[PDB]
Ligand binder design. Structure first.
Ligand SMILES: *C(=O)c1ccc(-c2ccc(C(=O)OCC)cn2)nc1
Ligand SMILES: *NNC(=O)c1ccc(-c2ccc(C(N)=O)cn2)nc1
Ligand SMILES: C[C@H](Cl)c1ccccc1
Ligand SMILES: C[C@H](Cl)c1ccccc1
Length: 9
């Protein structure tokens, strides 16, 4: 989940 969201940055 972390990576899936972190892509924003
Ligand atoms: C949520 O974005 C997320 C993405 C990816 C993973 C995850 C957990 C474990 C592995 C792993 O063991 O890969 C070995 C090649 C990969 N990706 N967790 C949560
Ligand atoms: N929020 N993160 C990003 O926008 C982001 C853009 C590009 C990359 C990235 C990572 C690795 C490579 C490579 N060729 O190994 C290229 N671009 N990460 C994050
Ligand atoms: C549940 C999280 Cl969002 C996830 C699923 C599949 C691939 C990467 C992340
Ligand atoms: C992105 C993944 Cl499917 C997720 C959504 C909402 C709560 C927890 C995980």
């Amino acid at each position: 989940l972390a990576a899936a969201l972190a892509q924003a940055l």
